[PDB]
Write a protein that binds this ligand. Structure first.
Ligand SMILES: CCCCCCCCCCCCCCCCCC(=O)OC[C@H](CO[C@@H]1O[C@H](CO[C@H]2O[C@H](CO)[C@H](O)[C@H](O)[C@H]2O)[C@H](O)[C@H](O)[C@H]1O)OC(=O)CCCCCCCCCCCCCCCCC
Ligand code: CLA
Ligand code: CLA
Ligand code: CLA
Ligand code: CLA
Ligand code: CLA
Ligand SMILES: CCCCCCCCCCCCCCCCCC(=O)OC[C@H](CO[C@@H]1O[C@H](CO)[C@H](O)[C@H](O)[C@H]1O)OC(=O)CCCCCCCCCCCCCCCCC
Ligand SMILES: CCCCCCCCCCCCCCCCCC(=O)OC[C@H](CO[C@@H]1O[C@H](CO)[C@H](O)[C@H](O)[C@H]1O)OC(=O)CCCCCCCCCCCCCCCCC
Ligand SMILES: CCCCCCCCCCCCCCCC(=O)OC[C@H](CO[C@@H]1O[C@H](CS(=O)(=O)O)[C@@H](O)[C@H](O)[C@H]1O)OC(=O)CCCCCCCCCCCCCCC
Ligand SMILES: CC1=C(/C=C/C(C)=C/C=C/C(C)=C/C=C/C=C(C)/C=C/C=C(C)/C=C/C2=C(C)CCCC2(C)C)C(C)(C)CCC1
Ligand SMILES: CC1=C(/C=C/C(C)=C/C=C/C(C)=C/C=C/C=C(C)/C=C/C=C(C)/C=C/C2=C(C)CCCC2(C)C)C(C)(C)CCC1
Ligand SMILES: [Fe+2]
Ligand SMILES: [Fe+2]
Lengths: 481, 56, 30, 315, 207, 37, 35, 30, 68, 30, 27, 48
């Protein structure tokens, strides 16, 4: 009999039961999607969309639902942060229920196709035995895929009939679902350009329908037919697995490095935005412009929105988490509740001191307050270690601009050390660490979890492609030698 | 009035109809079913003779 | 601890039940 | 060939189906499925229902801090009374939930379903060449359900007095009914209890006697054993007679208890024996009936906390 | 329906139609409002019918502010005050006074605001005493406790603004629109009271 | 609808059972400390 | 809200008509006995 | 949480009833 | 063996799955396939180098600032 | 909400189910 | 009770080893 | 404890830059390589 790892090979020469098992898998996938959406809506907290975005609460399916236009719920709230009017059928709960019903229907269809398998459709008219004309099925399926791709790219993203897609400004402050006009030209291959999505989908749909027609009309050559073993079905599996892990690599890379298809308002900021001081540079430029206008320090620093300062914080960096630090970010370092402001450190002489920000790659980084030219001026020494430039000796004073703590100056060395440690991470924020019993250690963004899972799956599927290609190209000796 | 209602709970309308469309639906469905039964009556056997039908 | 304990219990129980079912199916036919 | 209707009626009245879809079935199935769906949805999640009609609702849903034992589908509001309250008669669906429509919908569809279930039992008995009296036996639980859910609300004038669809609702309804009507002292409840206990006794005895006599269809030795045991020789030596008695006892008991229920629905209570044994001077001597009366009095004072406003409970 | 049409119907016809909860409409009369002779009149058949039941609620979002939101009514009708009687004085210069004495001056009500939260209250204007011009007369009234002291587990004042819109000098029959704000149910002290804003129509027969 | 020719039965000898049980228990021992954190 | 009433009326009428015309379709001769 | 457990238990019981009614052992030689 | 189940939908789709093992003698259209593979490889190199900032074009900016 | 109740319910659901499945598979195979 | 579950897992592994050693099927 | 011993040992003595540890690593890697190679060759040379 079959060993435990060969049980699913009983449908290798029975098209009806193959259709049945593939239907069962589709039903399971749809049911998972529906159940996960329902759970996410049950857990989601839409109270504050500024300091508590959906990517902060460890939401995985909600960003993907929101990416394509689902922005309302039957609970009376919207993802933007306004009251929901006439939500309609296509809400979060509606999508989850629709997926569940689809899963049930697919389950019933799978049961039917399993029960009745001896169909005349799968019988060769000449020989009378089960057969599949793989090139023609491929042509039909490619035709359908191209048609669907063109429809999506011409009616959904363009907003002609559909709702559009999520687009945001470069710094992720004002984003929403909008129609996207196609962008033909050198751009569009610019990954961060939303018009590339529409242009690509339209062009790829046209090419796909043309190729489907070709593969439907033209028979393969005998040399190619024998070379690629088009008579067998396992070569189809090997090629499909190959394309699948290729796609997995591409999607994981696009997710990790960011793109127009992965907005930061839905999945969170990127490791490389913290590496290059993206938000820090934007904030500095804005405050410098306000200062040069003629305003003082306090009012200029108060103009900075809390969202932009929140993005400039190492807690939201997806590369600061851990493998077994499970859960949402809010369980990591509490729920953000307010922005204290920008902290300026000044020695007794008057020189402004800047604290060196922790690189995204260190677990523990010593706190150092540098001069304007980079010379070290102050530093908290290692625990219980003799010091020569400590905070107490140098006499560093911290003053805050904008935010909750505006115009307040502290001179006590203890609070100065505390705020220096806080500012080592970036912007200082007040955190509620009691609601969720947060541990105190950073978790990882949904971006990081998605990338990790999909790269691991892609590697495993590369191995699967190797194995199945070897099996299909060595069938004579694999017949049980 | 805060909102709108049918306002027919205690009125005792015949067959519980207060809009002619309900009566039209009743008659239409009954007529369609009766027509189908009348057409199919030929397969049930005719009891033309005076003494026919289940009896003891 | 509820998440971890539940996950550990399920991981211990379900695959062992599957393996035992397969073995008992095998051992029936001598 | 045959017309569409001929094929349809051949399919409906076909004994080859896994479950017989009779002419009674064509009504039984939709009503029963509708009642089941509404009951499940209401039990899983439904807002509190204002049963008493005094602007205080009670919650009976799992999503509202309840469990299986204490969950129930709350009866219709007292303010509705006996009025028909369908969905389309409510201004909004939330109002329908608040006033307690689902209970009425479930009760109506369930009663129709059980009546058609009895009809379908008769129909399939007829189609298989059997004697058609299984439905007569089944009528006893049907009669009891009708008396519980329909006749008592009609007699009391409101659907809020009906049995809630929940485990704790049953106990509350029973305590209420004993408080207001003295169910335990009625001869018909005594007959129902006798019928139930006798049904259990005869079931156990028949099972034991038949199983013991099924040596390597009942033989005559079991009759001799029973005659020797309880000194009732020739009481039951015919198998048909014995099985007819087995069928007849609990059915009659349940019929009589349902009739007693429907009788009390019209305020015809059970026996009253308080203040019966009197001293020569004139003093009243307590009896176990008087202790039952004290328990009923205790049940009655806390019956409705804030519903009554007049000394006598005429409703 | 006007007062004559309402009084021309038998009880059987009205039953089940929802008319009994309605308020008479003044089809006749003039909108000039200068035909109302100055003096004092005994206000009888004073009826009031609300049209909206907006309630003040704190915004769920952190950045939002308290606002009046719409609600869905739960109690079937039973929200109309009727048969009220009092006194109505109108001055020659243009000043006017309104006072309610007796009648059905209160009605318990329950409305659900979006999100599932249902709030009860006691829509009432009892002991009203308003003084001011014909358009914009303002006053205050007492709101009794939602439940009596006998209730067991398992004063407040509110403002109002009337405004006469149409007058029929030959037969009185003054009609207009009103707005009021009153506290919510505060029984058991389990939650702070909320504010309900009610707009509606009012009819009165001062003869 | 007829007896499907593609009929086969899975087998698992005692050695395979021991291997599987050992693998499961060893993985649980290795990962329990991490999961409990 | 009246559309729901129309739909329910249609469904109930259809099922009741099915029940009524089912028993008029020579039901007593559907027995398996010999006569 | 507990409501989910109760719902799962009831759904499982109903599924067992359905399987027993439909996927039953065919009776032979009654 | 006996013919399989016959269904109107199956008969409708029968012509599609009725040309198994049907080939063209010779190499057929393999040269066109090779040309298209070469073109697709060139296009993939285009987009890969554009995304990697190793191929800089005037119109494309390759930055989060292109969302402007 | 306690861990003990949930884990006791899970074990009581699963262990007898596994035992019964073992016995049924043994019977069906024979 | 973490020590308890750790000990239970280790003892289960030891029992599996013992059963494999002493209760192996014949060739 | 094993990891601490190894780290402390590398601290005190340059374990990695020692020819005998290099031969130990080479022996372990070669053992794994030759085990895989022998297993693959023998299991692939299987007759019917
Ligand atoms: C439910 C309660 C509702 C409220 C109360 C309502 C009370 C109504 C009381 C009056 C109707 C009572 C009907 C009871 C059902 C029994 C009908 C029946 O047994 O009927 C059986 C008999 C059988 O008829 C016989 O049927 C025979 C067989 O015919 C067949 O064979 C013939 C040749 O031999 C021909 O070929 C013929 O075409 C073929 O069909 C012969 O034709 C005989 O000549 C013929 O008399 O029918 C007939 O009695 C003639 C038809 C009777 C009246 C039917 C009216 C139906 C509704 C009409 C309006 C519909 C409007 C629809 C509008 C849609 C669009 C909006
Ligand atoms: C108007 C014409 C038009 C336009 C504007 C676009 C625009 C676009 N296309 Mg589309 N396309 C078109 C026509 C068009 N296309 C047509 C006619 C075809 C033929 C059917 C395609 C086929 C096509 C494919 C197959 C892909 C695109 C992709 C893209 C995007 C390129 C930029 C990007 O997202 O980074 C993409 C950056 C890349 C580096 C591409 C990945 C390719 C690399 C080399 C493979 C990765 C390594 C590999 C897996 C090996 C693993 C190594 C690992 C172990 C280290 C962009 C949206 C890509 C895309 O959307 O990706 C998100 C993509 O994969 N296009
Ligand atoms: C009518 C069909 C339908 C519709 C409209 C939706 C709509 C949705 N689904 Mg659902 N779904 C469906 C059927 C459907 N689904 C079915 C049948 C299944 C079972 C397989 C699922 C399983 C499922 C899961 C598991 C999830 C969704 C999710 C989503 C949401 C995100 C959109 C999306 O798919 O990501 C965008 C879609 C893609 C990125 C697909 C890319 C396709 C690749 C690129 C094709 C490449 C190969 C191609 C053949 C090459 C040919 C090229 C040629 C044309 C030239 C959205 C609300 C997600 C969600 O938010 O949960 C609710 C989610 O997690 N769906
Ligand atoms: C690739 C797909 C994918 C991705 C990226 C995510 C990502 C995420 N999920 Mg989702 N989830 C998925 C699939 C996915 N999930 C599926 C298929 C299910 C159904 C089972 C769920 C069910 C689910 C729930 C119920 C929850 C999440 C949550 C989360 C978040 C927390 C991160 C996490 O899982 O930490 C955990 C990560 C790990 C444990 C890493 C696994 C490392 C290895 C592979 C483990 C191997 C163990 C091995 C078998 C030995 C076991 C020993 C034994 C003692 C058990 C994160 C956004 C949580 C959240 O914040 O949402 C609100 C949450 O509550 N997910
Ligand atoms: C498109 C995906 C795909 C498909 C359709 C198949 C289909 C098949 N494979 Mg291939 N395979 C794949 C991917 C795929 N595989 C990948 C990615 C790998 C690398 C890991 C392999 C490695 C592989 C090997 C080494 C072998 C097969 C074999 C087989 C056949 C029997 C299936 C089997 O093992 O019995 C059913 C399997 C089980 C009952 C065991 C399941 C237990 C798993 C490991 C744990 C549970 C996983 C969880 C529940 C679901 C994870 C979902 C995740 C993928 C997202 C069947 C034709 C076998 C064969 O036919 O060779 C003769 C065989 O020996 N496959
Ligand atoms: C370790 C790598 C590896 C290995 C050993 C195999 C092995 C196999 N593959 Mg798989 N495959 C791989 C990677 C691999 N593949 C990748 C990355 C892809 C893309 C997703 C595929 C896609 C693929 C398909 C679609 C098919 C196979 C098939 C096969 C089998 C036949 C060999 C063949 O078709 O030519 C393998 C050809 C190559 C590996 C390409 C050769 C190297 C090219 C020419 C280099 C080009 C470099 C170029 C200059 C660009 C430079 C980029 C630079 C700027 C970074 C065999 C089992 C076929 C099969 O199953 O047969 C029945 C089949 O249909 N493979
Ligand atoms: C079976 C193993 C299950 C381990 C669960 C451990 C746990 O306790 O999780 C605990 C977490 C939940 O964790 C909880 O989340 C809560 C959310 O409100 C709170 O934040 C809690 O504080 C937090 O503890 O459970 C999961 O998230 C499981 C999700 C499944 C894994 C998804 C990511 C998988 C990525 C890799 C996939 C491919 C791997 C290939 C490998 C080859
Ligand atoms: C078993 C024992 C049975 C004992 C029966 C005892 C006698 C019962 C007498 C009933 C009298 C009914 C008179 C007509 C009723 C009527 O017209 O309903 C009319 C009612 C009224 O309907 C409501 O009326 C209200 C007042 O106007 C409102 O208008 C509402 O909008 C409207 O819905 O409709 C119903 O209640 C449902 C009727 C259909 C119910 C299903 C019947 C299925 C019958 C199957 C067998 C057929 C043969
Ligand atoms: C959390 C989930 C649960 C995890 C539990 C982990 C604990 C360890 C589990 C080990 C499971 C092993 C299953 C396979 C055993 C097997 O195949 O034996 C095969 C042999 C057959 O040999 C033959 O047996 C013959 C008798 S008979 O045929 O078996 O009836 C006899 O003649 C002779 O011995 C020989 O010929 O069985 C026997 O010899 C005696 C019967 C033993 C049956 C298994 C008993 C398991 C008891 C578990 C107790 C747990 C507590 C103690 C833990 C240390
Ligand atoms: C029939 C029907 C119905 C119902 C339906 C339903 C209700 C369904 C459901 C369904 C469902 C409810 C489904 C579910 C599913 C789930 C799943 C399918 C899951 C999976 C998971 C997984 C697979 C995972 C895995 C893992 C883990 C564990 C972790 C990580 C790692 C891994 C990946 C390994 C109704 C009557 C209503 C209507 C009609 C039809
Ligand atoms: C065959 C085949 C395939 C594929 C297919 C396809 C998909 C194709 C496509 C193809 C394509 C799709 C191609 C394209 C190309 C493109 C190009 C090649 C472009 C170019 C451009 C240029 C060259 C430009 C230039 C310039 C600029 C930059 C600007 C200014 C002006 C000038 C001119 C300077 C596969 C593998 C799947 C499978 C097998 C079969
Ligand atoms: Fe018997
Ligand atoms: Fe060897």
């Amino acid at each position: 009999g079959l060993p435990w790892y060969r049980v699913h090979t009983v449908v290798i020469n029975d098209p009806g039961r193959l259709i049945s098992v593939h239907l069962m898998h589709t039903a399971l996938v749809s049911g998972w999607a529906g159940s996960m959406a329902l759970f996410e809506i049950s857990v989601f907290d839409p109270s504050d969309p500024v300091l508590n975005p959906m990517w902060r609460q460890g939401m995985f399916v909600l960003p993907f639902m929101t990416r394509l236009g689902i922005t309302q719920s039957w609970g009376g709230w919207t993802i933007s942060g306004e009251t929901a009017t006439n939500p309609g059928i296509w809400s979060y709960e509606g999508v989850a229920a629709a997926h569940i019903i689809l899963s049930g229907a697919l389950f019933l269809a799978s049961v039917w196709h399993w029960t009745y398998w001896d169909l005349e459709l799968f019988r060769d008219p000449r020989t009378g035995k089960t057969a599949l004309d793989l090139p023609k099925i491929f042509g039909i399926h490619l035709f359908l895929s191209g048609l669907l791709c063109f429809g999506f790219g011409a009616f959904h993203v363009t907003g002609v009939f559909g709702p559009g897609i999520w687009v945001s400004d470069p710094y992720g402050l004002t984003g929403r679902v909008q129609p996207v006009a196609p962008s033909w030209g050198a751009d569009g291959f610019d990954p961060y350009n939303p018009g590339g999505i529409a242009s690509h989908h339209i062009a790829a749909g046209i090419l796909g329908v043309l190729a489907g027609l070709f593969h439907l009309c033209v028979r393969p050559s005998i040399r190619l037919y024998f070379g690629l073993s088009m008579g067998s079905i396992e070569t189809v599996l090997s090629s499909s697995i190959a394309a699948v892990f290729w796609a997995a690599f591409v999607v994981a890379g696009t997710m990790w490095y960011g793109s127009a298809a992965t907005p930061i308002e839905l999945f969170g900021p990127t490791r490389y935005q913290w590496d290059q001081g993206f938000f820090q540079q934007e904030i500095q430029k804005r405050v410098q412009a306000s200062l040069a206008e003629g305003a003082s320090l306090s009012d200029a620093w108060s103009r900075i929105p809390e969202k932009l300062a929140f993005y400039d914080y190492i807690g939201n960096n997806p590369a600061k988490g851990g493998l077994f630090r499970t859960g949402a970010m809010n369980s990591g370092d509490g729920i953000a509740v307010g922005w204290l402001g920008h902290a300026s450190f000044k020695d007794q002489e008057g020189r402004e001191l800047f604290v060196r920000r922790m690189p995204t790659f260190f677990e523990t980084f010593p706190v150092l307050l540098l001069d304007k030219d980079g010379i070290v001026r102050a530093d908290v020494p290692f625990r219980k270690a003799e010091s020569k430039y400590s905070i107490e000796q140098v006499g560093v004073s911290v003053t805050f601009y904008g935010g909750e703590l505006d115009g307040l100056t502290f001179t006590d060395p203890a609070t100065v050390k505390k705020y220096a440690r806080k500012a080592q991470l970036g912007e200082i924020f007040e955190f509620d660490r009691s609601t969720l019993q947060s541990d105190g250690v950073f978790r990882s963004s949904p971006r990081g979890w998605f990338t990790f899972g999909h790269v691991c799956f892609a590697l495993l599927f590369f191995f699967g492609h190797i194995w199945h290609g070897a099996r299909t190209i060595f069938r004579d000796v694999f017949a049980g030698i | 009035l805060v909102d709108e209602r049918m306002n027919g709970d205690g009125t005792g309308r015949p067959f519980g109809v207060n809009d002619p469309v309900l009566g039209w639906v009743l008659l239409g469905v009954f007529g369609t079913m009766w027509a189908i039964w009348f057409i199919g009556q030929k397969d049930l056997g005719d009891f033309e003779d005076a003494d026919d039908g289940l009896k003891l | 601890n509820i998440y971890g304990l539940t996950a550990t219990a399920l991981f211990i129980i379900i695959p062992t039940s599957f393996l035992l079912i397969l073995y008992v199916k095998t051992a029936s036919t001598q | 060939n045959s017309s569409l209707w001929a094929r349809f009626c051949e399919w409906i009245t076909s004994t080859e189906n896994r479950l017989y879809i009779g002419w009674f079935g064509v009504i039984m199935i939709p009503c029963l499925l509708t009642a089941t769906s509404v009951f499940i949805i209401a039990f899983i999640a439904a807002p509190p229902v204002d049963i008493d009609g005094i602007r205080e609702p009670v919650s009976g849903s799992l999503l509202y801090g309840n469990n299986i034992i204490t969950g129930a589908v709350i009866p219709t509001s007292n303010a509705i009374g006996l009025h028909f309250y369908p969905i389309w008669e409510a201004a909004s669906l939330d109002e329908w939930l608040y006033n307690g429509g689902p209970y009425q919908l479930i009760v109506c569809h369930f009663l129709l379903g059980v009546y058609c279930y009895m009809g379908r039992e008769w129909e399939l008995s007829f189609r298989l060449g059997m004697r058609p009296w299984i439905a007569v036996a089944y009528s006893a639980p049907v009669a009891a359900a009708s008396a519980v859910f329909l006749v008592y609300p009609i007699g009391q004038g409101s659907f809020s007095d009906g049995m809630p669809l929940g485990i704790s609702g049953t106990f509350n309804f029973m305590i209420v009914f004993q408080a207001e009507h003295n169910i335990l002292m009625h001869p018909f409840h005594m007959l129902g209890v006798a019928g139930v206990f006798g049904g259990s006794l005869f079931s156990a005895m028949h099972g034991s006697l038949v199983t013991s006599s099924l040596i390597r269809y009942n033989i005559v030795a079991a009759h001799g054993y029973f005659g020797r045991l309880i000194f009732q020789y020739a009481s039951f030596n015919n198998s048909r007679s014995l099985h007819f008695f087995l069928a007849a006892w609990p059915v009659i008991g349940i019929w009589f208890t349902a009739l007693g229920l429907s009788t009390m629905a019209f305020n015809l209570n059970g026996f009253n024996f308080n203040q019966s044994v009197v001293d020569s001077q004139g003093r009243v001597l307590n009896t176990w009936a008087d202790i039952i009366n004290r328990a009923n009095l205790g049940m009655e004072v806390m019956h409705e906390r804030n519903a009554h406003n007049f000394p006598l409970d005429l409703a | 329906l006007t007062f004559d049409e309402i009084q021309g119907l038998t009880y059987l016809q009205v039953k089940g139609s929802g008319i009994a909860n309605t308020c008479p409409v003044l089809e006749s009369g003039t909108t000039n409002l200068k035909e109302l002779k100055a003096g004092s009149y005994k206000l009888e058949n004073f009826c009031i019918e609300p049209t909206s039941f907006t309630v003040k609620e704190e915004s769920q979002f952190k950045g939002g502010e308290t606002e009046f939101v719409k609600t869905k009514l739960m109690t079937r009708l039973t929200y109309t005050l009727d048969a009220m009687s009092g006194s109505f004085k109108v001055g020659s210069d243009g000043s006017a006074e309104l006072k309610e004495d007796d009648g059905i001056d209160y009605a318990a009500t329950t409305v659900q605001l979006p999100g599932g939260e249902r709030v009860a209250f006691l829509f009432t204007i009892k002991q009203f005493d308003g003084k001011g011009t014909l358009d914009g007369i303002k006053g205050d009234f007492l709101v009794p406790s939602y439940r009596g002291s006998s209730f067991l587990d398992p004063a407040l004042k509110g403002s109002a603004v009337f405004s006469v819109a149409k007058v029929d000098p030959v037969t009185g029959e003054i009609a207009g629109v009103f707005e009021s704000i009153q506290p919510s149910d505060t029984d058991l002290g389990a939650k702070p009271p909320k504010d309900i804003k009610v707009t509606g129509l009012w009819y009165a027969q001062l003869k | 609808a007829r007896p499907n020719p593609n009929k086969q039965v899975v087998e698992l000898n005692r050695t395979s059972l021991y291997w599987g049980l050992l693998l499961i228990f060893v993985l649980a021992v290795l990962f329990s400390s991490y999961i409990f954190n | 809200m009246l559309t729901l009433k129309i739909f329910v009326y249609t469904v109930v009428t259809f099922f009741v008509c099915l029940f009524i015309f089912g028993f008029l379709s020579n039901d007593p001769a559907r027995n398996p006995g010999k006569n | 949480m507990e409501a989910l457990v109760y719902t799962f238990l009831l759904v499982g019981t109903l599924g067992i009833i359905f399987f027993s009614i439909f996927f039953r052992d065919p009776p032979r030689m009654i | 063996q006996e013919p399989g189940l016959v269904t109107p939908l199956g008969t409708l789709l029968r012509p599609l799955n009725s040309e198994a093992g049907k080939v063209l003698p010779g190499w057929g259209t393999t040269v066109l396939m090779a040309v298209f593979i070469l073109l697709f490889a060139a296009f993939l190199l285009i987009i890969l180098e554009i995304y990697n900032s190793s191929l800089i074009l005037d119109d494309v900016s390759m930055s989060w600032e292109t969302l402007a």
